[PDB]
Amino acid sequence: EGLVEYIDAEEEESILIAMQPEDLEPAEANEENDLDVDPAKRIRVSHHATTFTHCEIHPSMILGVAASIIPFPDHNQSPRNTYQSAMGKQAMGVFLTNYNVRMDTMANILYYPQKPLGTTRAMEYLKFRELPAGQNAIVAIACYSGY
Amino acid sequence: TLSHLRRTNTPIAKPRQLHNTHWGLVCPAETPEGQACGLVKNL
């Protein structure tokens, strides 16, 4: 019906992609320095060129399979999100529902897996909630002794 | 299991840096630590 177009890198040179469908072509107010807004929210570039052609699906989609596991990756120092990417692949849980029937050299399973209390909208398509690899543990940040 | 089936290799200017054109095709953060870092990519 012509609503989506498979764009490669070379053809990516001739187009002007928007970022946020809604906030990227609504009208003027404007807001910037104009009263009033939410002080605690972030500062966005703003749309300043308007002769768009395409528009992105949802930015979270720039990510990979291991990376979309991370909660709020846009609040972390970059090299950190790369570490979690390597470790997520070395965590432990349900690796297939048929583990009791296969015969493969070495395999680990978690007595009591849990779906995390904080999740990505992208975990949904990766079926992480049905095959988790961690436990929601109660955690304290203190000194307490020195061990 | 998922993350291995989407893996990109590269044999041997500066082909390790994350290049602008990677936007939305290869994932920025996903990549192996040390040894062969950045020659390997996840989609």
């Binding site: 469908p21 809604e22 398509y125 | 998922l2 089936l5």
Partner: peptide, 30 residues
Amino acid sequence: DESAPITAEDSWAVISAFFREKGLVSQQLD
């Protein structure tokens, strides 16, 4: 009202229907 454009949440419904097809290894399969 079928006219008003896509917004915040609506952006996801598309995604899921993308995966409802190609799944997760389409490149490998195709």
